Amino acid sequence: DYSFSCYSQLEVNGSQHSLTCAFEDPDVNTTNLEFEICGALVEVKCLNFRKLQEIYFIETKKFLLIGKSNICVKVGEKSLTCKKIDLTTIVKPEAPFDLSVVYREGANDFVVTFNTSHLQKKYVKVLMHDVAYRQEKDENKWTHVNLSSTKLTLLQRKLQPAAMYEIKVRSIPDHYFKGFWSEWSPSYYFRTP
Template identity: 75%
Template sequence: MTILGTALGMVFYLLQVVSGESGYAQNGDFEDAELDDYSFSCYSQLEVDGPQHLLSCAFEDPDVNSTNLEFEICEGLLEVKCLNFSKLQETYFIKTKKFLLIGDSTICVKLGGKHITCQKMNIVKRVKPEAPFDVKVIYREEANEFVVTFNTSHLQKKYVKDLLHEVVYRLEKNENDWMHVNISSTKLTLLQRKLQPNAMYEIKVRSIPNTNYFEGFWSEWSPSSHFRTPENNSELSLLYGLVSLTIRRLWNNCARNQKR
């Protein structure tokens, strides 16, 4: 019986060891961590507050229980090896002047001080510009055109100054029928003849980095602006032209008769 008891004890011990090596931890938090998907995505915004840059990360699965989770960034930093993120609702962020802006950094999700998952990324390749603003549309009657202008905070920045802008506009009644124009300047001309007369239009803009060094994602859309096109007066213009021609001919005839 002693031999049998010893054998059973060894089997039980081996099962415990195998169980531990397979990741079935005693700690309930780590056990849950094995079951969840902690993949995440990040974007950067440079010079958001003077020389300070912003890096924001969030889990791709919105249902992840992030109560005890932390984010940490290491490498690609000035003067320090690692920095911890702050948390606001479901977003983790860090605002600092210590990003080197050269080379890769390692961003890790931590639970109980231990890394669950990590990603290597270069924050200058994940730039999301700030949204354009102050979209204005001015009608130039003499040229039969609309001049669209807008502003962007990146014109005053040291980094990410070159942007590609996507301008979209539509008839207000056509919810999904957007017209798209890509430009590198902050000014666009829309010809009146290509728009419907006496109609209300909505227009908005977004931006993306347009350089080989800084890359990334589209910004949020600017607030929408609205403008109305004038009525089509082509028939009135034709009538006015005929009347003017008739008056000139009558005037010329009168002048000739007076000379006689």
């Protein structure tokens, strides 16, 4: 079996996009395998993936982003398994940054704010953010809040007092483009009064 998944990042570096694919099952030593993609491309007809460590991927500006394209696993010449994908559906956004919580003794709440480089982009602009936070007492028990802007607020009396909280955010394409979740933004730790 040669199952594999792939995620694209539009305008990742400047105006160039990336495409990263991986093999589902962790195995096969220094494989004679290599990846390729055709269709939905411009200047060229097909492009050759590079191969770094254990992952394969490319960085072009050549993605048309209209209609599907053929991504096939190949050895020398022998084509094995292919897969017609529409890169605008497998978009993994860049993680949010500048996360920060501010406490206002005036209104008795916690203002969560963060930034995303997707706001200044041309394609994947609209995102759907997911703020998650757990308590020191608990471990794998997080509570998510699905926002749509870069500012959230949590009222004092909504979570333990004298409690220390860990908070983080991630993003996802929420509009025309579809895809997976972004990595998590580094965590912020603050203590409750």
